[PDB]
Design a binder for this molecule. Structure first.
Ligand SMILES: CCCCCCCC/C=C\CCCCCCCC(=O)O[C@H](COC(=O)CCCCCCCCCCCCCCC)COP(=O)(O)OC[C@@H](O)CO
Ligand SMILES: CCCCCCCC/C=C\CCCCCCCC(=O)O[C@H](COC(=O)CCCCCCCCCCCCCCC)COP(=O)(O)OC[C@@H](O)CO
Ligand SMILES: CCCCCCCC/C=C\CCCCCCCC(=O)O[C@H](COC(=O)CCCCCCCCCCCCCCC)COP(=O)(O)OC[C@@H](O)CO
Ligand SMILES: CCCCCCCC/C=C\CCCCCCCC(=O)O[C@H](COC(=O)CCCCCCCCCCCCCCC)COP(=O)(O)OC[C@@H](O)CO
Ligand SMILES: CCCCCCCC/C=C\CCCCCCCC(=O)O[C@H](COC(=O)CCCCCCCCCCCCCCC)COP(=O)(O)OC[C@@H](O)CO
Ligand SMILES: CCCCCCCC/C=C\CCCCCCCC(=O)O[C@H](COC(=O)CCCCCCCCCCCCCCC)COP(=O)(O)OC[C@@H](O)CO
Ligand SMILES: CCCCCCCC/C=C\CCCCCCCC(=O)O[C@H](COC(=O)CCCCCCCCCCCCCCC)COP(=O)(O)OC[C@@H](O)CO
Ligand SMILES: CCCCCCCC/C=C\CCCCCCCC(=O)O[C@H](COC(=O)CCCCCCCCCCCCCCC)COP(=O)(O)OC[C@@H](O)CO
Ligand SMILES: CCCCCCCC/C=C\CCCCCCCC(=O)O[C@H](COC(=O)CCCCCCCCCCCCCCC)COP(=O)(O)OC[C@@H](O)CO
Ligand SMILES: CCCCCCCC/C=C\CCCCCCCC(=O)O[C@H](COC(=O)CCCCCCCCCCCCCCC)COP(=O)(O)OC[C@@H](O)CO
Ligand SMILES: CCCCCCCC/C=C\CCCCCCCC(=O)O[C@H](COC(=O)CCCCCCCCCCCCCCC)COP(=O)(O)OC[C@@H](O)CO
Ligand SMILES: CCCCCCCC/C=C\CCCCCCCC(=O)O[C@H](COC(=O)CCCCCCCCCCCCCCC)COP(=O)(O)OC[C@@H](O)CO
Ligand SMILES: [Ca+2]
Ligand SMILES: [Ca+2]
Ligand SMILES: [Ca+2]
Ligand SMILES: [Ca+2]
Lengths: 649, 649
């Protein structure tokens, strides 16, 4: 039905082996929720836990927190208007929205004592039996959201504004990015159908069109997210450094200019931990390369041996099995990257998130493109280097030409498989898991439905937006640097994106708990990843056009094609950046409107008379250069006399 | 000696043929200098003119103008501190400097009536007999400046600060850029002497070092000019759009959001005029290419025919004559570009200056690099295309191998000649001209020296900073993309730069009138030119390394060298941009310092009692979820009871 006015829920498991140290700590938890000004209510928690629900009781402290937060955006330049006048009648002018209300209640829960909160961060302090502070889903809103989004072909800006109003700015920026990407993916769908139907195979024109589309989509999304950050009032929140509660330290030094005590970590220890990425990256390169070389050698052996029924089908079963198995290897590698990033100490949330995103992007880049890269650039130009692997396979079974159109076919079997297993591990396998959890199964006899709902809500996983960003970034990479082999692939991705905008919505609706509303200026470092996946596309796809249309292949033609495609990409990037700086986006227009919205003769004679008095008190030619003519009129007659006697001789 | 307190001088020639329309207009001029609040003094002007001197009489109007100008920088974000409190005691906290005082007096002279001034802009209005409004040089300051700068090996920041204090921010930014360029040019001087002494000829390592140096110098100058703009308080003055008084218009429309009347020009007419640049550019390409092809064909003919005394010397006389003659052709082309930019109507000063700088950069790029480009990239790989020119020269005189080390020798004869003729047309030819002007030759008998000084001052030319910027940009281009042929050239440029910092200073001292102090955030579009001259260097210089070290030359080796050098340049650019974003420049440090410098139980019980009263006035389970437990303590005992009965079963 509906929530009972509960703003946040803290789980607070109480294990039996450390009960007393939990229990008195539980008392401290209520103390930590009383001095801030939150009303608490303790209830039973399943699986040996003790749920507490917190809401805002006094609206005066909440209005003080709203005014202080708006002041905090005012000093950081996020809010350019007047914050408040130390009295809260301005909340009727700009209403407080549910996302920022939940964000401020979470800040009141989790910030330390010396900025108003009392931090119940579940890692550092004695409150280690806390592990999850989460808001509650509105099931009526989720049902209407899913019913509205599944009944429309396209989404407008009001839906993204509703997502910003409910779930915060990060989820709204993801859904706006996915909507813009899905709308921009119609263009390579149309030209991919045109290239697949008319242009034959491995068209250079399609590669140039993909590079131009990548440039146009990237810069137009940068303009669109600038406009969205101005519209949502979160422009410049990336400059606000947020302290990380898990950040370990040993020195609390002073700031050299201001004097606030800053907790400092030695950067050489962080560099020494960061240097562990290189053996991890090279070990991942070696292991994944050995696995991919073994799989392609196996499928070459099957193409050599297996004669007649299913050569076209059973010639990519190692590739299909690799795409099927790579979620498990990917999950192991992302767990290793998460452990390495937790080991690699970071003081701010944004740097930690950027480093994690970089590690995840590199790992998923390898495990999602290394097979296609080996096929297009190692197997195609020289396939004689993997002969001992076929010797090993022939010796095992005892107990030549390279097809240039291979990277086309293996792309098709790469895409259709990866659109199935990603529909498996993200949609239907969690559906079967929650159905199995549902089929496996006093509370004051008028709130037992709500307590059962919050008890099954806390067992769900916290929603991660970086995984969905990663999936769409890898899809953009497929379009940018491998869609020239199979031009229909973007079309398939288009259909997938229409599912994704709904299905990920369902992933927030029923398959995950409500995320904490966080404010983001942009999608962040994924932008950089997109930029990289643009540039490498101009290196990659056109090279495929030279390597599969070919008579022997020459190095100078390949280098000329790569050079021309990359310089065409750079020229198109400069032209699009020049054009899009002239469109006059309404954010800067509103900023200009806001910036616009936010006898002497007697005086000169009195001044020269004062100068005459000061001269008569005592630079004599300094005074008498000006004191000979001091009025307005006598300048006119002496100028006329100088004109008249100028022509008198 | 010293000026007589004169802030500005207006020349105001009065020709005899339109005397009366001048003379009454002269009266209007005094009116235009009286309502603003300036004291005027009319004096005789030589060569049928009538000089007037204006100073500030009332300091109240000047302080009002200072307060209004500081308010204007406050709304535009240039000045972040408090502007004023509507009373002028804050001028003792931050003293008014002579450059900004002259800038504000020039603004009071030249701005129109509806922002405080009374515009005596010498083009648009009835005041067309005005042609020059100029400040007066301080000859004591100029003498001490030249004596101080000629007696020091290096200049520190106090000298550039003195130049900012006297002549404004544009001249100071030029001298800071020249000082930074001269200090950074020691590095290619050292590695050029090392490559010329030890590495032989056409070193790839020297080309990579030049690319790395170009990257490091460009990004470090960007950081340095950001720091200088923060230090001088002119950070963000490029956002302040300044209206151009020569801008023609036919519609005065309204702003669509604010309502100020904006004078609009149709952009299709501006585009139609801008399209005239392409025939001008292609005509310049064709004419300069024909002249250069004729000159190199002539010198190939002299190398073929002239046998024994001076083949090494008389084999570059067409090139020497081309460098000697190119100032005249360059001046004709810059006059044509100035006429085209005056025809091409612009509404703002910055866009007009950027378009003029782009046209001048393209023309000077052609006339300063096209001979070296034709030698390095047209003559070297295939020199059989210019045989009919030698047939013409042999037919005229009647009445084969290509040296790969040619671009070295012609570079030397290009540099040593261009360091002489630019020392001719900029230093000693104006010296002989002013000596000839001096040798060719009542005023109230105590100010005749000052009147003769201001009479010989007004005949001088207004100082142009864009020409000196252009000369240093072309010198940077020589180092960036042609110093691999002759590595000693940067060394010569180093010596020239030590002259230039003094000689251009002398060009402002005795050879030009005092410029109007204008505030600039940066050196402007020349930065973009430097960036282009960096990137093309990675294309050019390494290509020379492939084209002159070579056995026939292959296309794939040249393309691989160009690709590796350009991608090394891009990688070095990314690395330097990453490193220089971590140095913590003191401008952002000062901005952070300035940003830093600029019981509840009873309340919750009262709120829940008010909720109980509102419930009793009449959502019953909504209230009774919280109303069953409202205090602090009973939550603790019921939580302890839930813990105790949780383990009781
Ligand atoms: C762009 C997006 C979609 C394009 C849809 C095109 C649908 C029309 C398909 C028309 C068609 O099938 O004929 C082909 C095109 O003939 C042509 O080359 C003539 C150019 C047709 C112009 C279509 C653009 C020849 O078939 P092919 O010879 O290859 O056997
Ligand atoms: C492919 C090879 C990498 C597979 C790594 C899978 C194992 C990942 C893992 O859990 O190891 C953690 C170390 O962190 C890491 O891995 C990072 C180690 C990087 C060293 C490179 C691996 C060789 C131990 O964490 P702890 O048990 O302390 O809790
Ligand atoms: C990434 C590393 C990939 C390592 C894959 C295993 C490498 C297999 C191996 O033994 O090394 C040689 C590489 O030749 C190969 O197989 C071809 C692998 C090509 C990988 C090169 C990518 C760069 C074989 O040489 P051969 O046994 O004949 O003595
Ligand atoms: C191949 C089929 C991969 C099956 C992948 C799978 O769902 O089972 C995983 C075990 O398999 C695995 O270790 C996966 C190993 C993948 C090896 C790569 C396959 C190439 C075969 C040529 C663990 O399943 P989980 O723990 O998620 O429950
Ligand atoms: C296989 C090769 C993969 C290359 C990966 C390069 C792109 C990495 C993705 C970029 C990223 O997500 O993190 C950026 C790291 O800065 C970087 O990129 C530096 C390069 C790191 C790659 C090593 C932060 O971006 P920001 O917006 O915070 O600034
Ligand atoms: C940007 C990075 C640029 C990489 C391309 C440069 C690779 C080296 C080019 C020279 C390769 C080479 O000399 O051999 C050629 C065949 O091998 C090749 O086609 C090399 C194909 C490798 C594919 C590399 C594409 C870059 C994709 C990322 C023909 O032999 P050749 O004419 O000399 O007789
Ligand atoms: C960098 C800036 C300036 C370098 C100044 C170097 C002055 C020392 C000059 C010493 C010298 O003339 O001997 C040359 C260097 O020998 C060598 O290759 C040995 C390396 C010398 C290391 C110098 C660096 C050999 O002469 P080459 O054989 O060419 O007849
Ligand atoms: C090399 C060929 C260009 C040489 C131009 C030298 C003549 C430059 C010149 O004064 O011509 C002005 C036209 O503006 C221009 O030139 C721009 C004309 C551009 C057309 C291209 C030239 C062919 C006339 O200005 P107006 O007499 O009206 O005062
Ligand atoms: C820039 C345009 C430069 C035009 C220079 C004058 C062009 C001289 C000319 O008549 O054109 C042909 C070009 O061959 C040449 O001379 C060589 C000029 C090379 C210029 C190519 C640069 C691109 C000669 O051909 P041919 O008389 O044998 O019939
Ligand atoms: C060649 C010597 C160039 C002499 C340049 C010179 O100072 O005299 C100019 C006349 O020469 C000129 O038209 C210059 C024509 C330059 C033609 C290019 C020379 C190549 C000769 C192979 C006009 O001098 P100005 O008006 O400044 O007094
Ligand atoms: C022979 C080829 C010469 C290429 C010249 C390219 C560099 C031109 C120099 C760049 C310049 O000074 O003006 C910029 C024009 O924007 C441009 O560059 C656009 C390219 C214009 C060149 C056509 C304005 O820069 P902004 O800082 O105002 O932004
Ligand atoms: C960035 C712009 C890149 C330009 C380089 C591409 C030029 C075309 C390369 C192909 C030129 C070509 O096929 O002929 C070669 C000789 O000519 C050449 O060395 C061309 C030399 C032209 C110099 C261009 C340098 C760019 C400088 C700006 C050898 O003949 P091949 O091996 O085929 O038998
Ligand atoms: Ca999916
Ligand atoms: Ca997803
Ligand atoms: Ca000079
Ligand atoms: Ca100069």
């Amino acid at each position: 039905e509906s929530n009972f006015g509960v703003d946040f829920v803290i789980h607070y498991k109480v294990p039996a082996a450390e009960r007393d140290e939990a229990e008195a700590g539980f008392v401290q938890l209520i103390r930590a929720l009383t001095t801030v000004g939150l009303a608490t209510e303790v209830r039973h928690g399943e699986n040996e836990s003790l749920l507490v629900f917190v809401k805002v009781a006094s609206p005066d402290l909440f209005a003080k927190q709203v005014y202080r937060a708006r002041l905090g955006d005012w000093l950081h330049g996020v809010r350019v208007s007047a914050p408040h006048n130390d009295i809260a009648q301005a909340l009727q002018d700009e209403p407080v929205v549910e996302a920022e209300r939940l964000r401020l209640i979470y800040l009141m829960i989790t910030k330390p004592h010396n900025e108003g909160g009392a931090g119940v961060t579940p890692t550092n302090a004695k409150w280690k039996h806390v592990e999850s502070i989460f808001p509650l889903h509105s099931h009526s809103f989720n049902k209407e959201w899913i019913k509205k989004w599944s009944s429309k072909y396209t989404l407008e800006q009001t839906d993204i504004d509703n997502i910003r109003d409910k779930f915060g700015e990060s989820v709204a920026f993801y859904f706006a990015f996915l909507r813009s990407y899905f709308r921009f993916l119609v263009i390579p769908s149309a030209f991919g159908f045109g290239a697949w139907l008319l242009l034959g195979q491995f068209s250079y024109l399609y590669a140039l069109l993909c590079g131009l589309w990548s440039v146009v989509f990237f810069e137009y999304w940068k303009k669109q997210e600038v406009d969205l950050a101005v519209q949502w009032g979160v422009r410049g929140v990336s400059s606000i450094q947020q302290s990380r509660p898990e950040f370990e330290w040993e020195h609390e030094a002073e700031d050299p200019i201001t004097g606030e005590p800053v907790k400092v970590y030695p950067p050489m220890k962080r560099v020494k931990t960061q240097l562990l990425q290189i053996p991890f990256a090279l070990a991942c390169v070696v292991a994944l390369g050995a696995l991919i070389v073994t799989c392609n050698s196996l499928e070459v052996f099957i193409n050599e041996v297996y004669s007649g029924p299913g050569k076209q089908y059973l010639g990519f079963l190692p590739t299909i099995f690799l795409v099927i198995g790579t979620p498990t290897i990917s999950g192991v590698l992302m767990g290793a990257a998460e452990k390495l990033n937790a080991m690699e100490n970071y003081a701010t949330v944004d740097a930690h998130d950027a480093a994690l995103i970089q590690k995840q992007f590199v790992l998923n880049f390898m495990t999602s493109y290394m097979a296609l890269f080996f096929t297009a650039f190692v197997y195609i130009p020289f396939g004689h280097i993997l002969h001992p692997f076929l010797n090993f396979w022939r010796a095992t079974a005892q107990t030549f030409q390279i097809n240039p159109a291979r990277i086309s076919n293996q792309m098709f079997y790469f895409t259709v498989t990866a659109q199935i297993v990603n529909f498996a591990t993200e949609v239907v396998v969690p559906y079967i898991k929650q159905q199995a959890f549902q089929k496996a199964k006093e509370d004051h006899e008028e709130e037992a439905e709500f307590l059962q709902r919050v008890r099954e809500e806390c067992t769900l996983e916290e929603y991660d937006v970086s995984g969905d960003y990663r999936e769409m970034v890898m899809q953009f990479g497929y379009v940018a640097m491998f869609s020239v082999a199979w031009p229909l692939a973007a079309c398939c991705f288009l259909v997938n994106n229409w599912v994704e905008l709904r299905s990920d919505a369902l992933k927030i609706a029923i398959s995950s708990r409500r995320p904490i509303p966080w404010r983001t200026d942009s999608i962040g470092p994924w932008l950089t990843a997109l930029s990289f996946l643009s540039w490498l596309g101009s290196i990659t796809s056109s090279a495929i056009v030279y390597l599969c249309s070919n008579s022997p292949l020459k190095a100078w033609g390949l280098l000329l094609s790569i050079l021309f495609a990359e310089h065409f990409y750079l020229v198109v990037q400069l032209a699009v950046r020049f054009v899009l700086s002239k469109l006059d986006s309404p954010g800067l227009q509103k900023e200009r409107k806001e910036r616009f919205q936010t006898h002497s003769e007697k005086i000169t004679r009195e001044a020269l008379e004062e100068e005459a008095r000061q001269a008569s008190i005592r630079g004599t030619p300094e005074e008498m250069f000006w004191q000979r003519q001091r009025g307005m009129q006598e300048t006119i007659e002496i100028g006329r006399r100088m004109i008249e006697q100028q022509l008198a001789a």
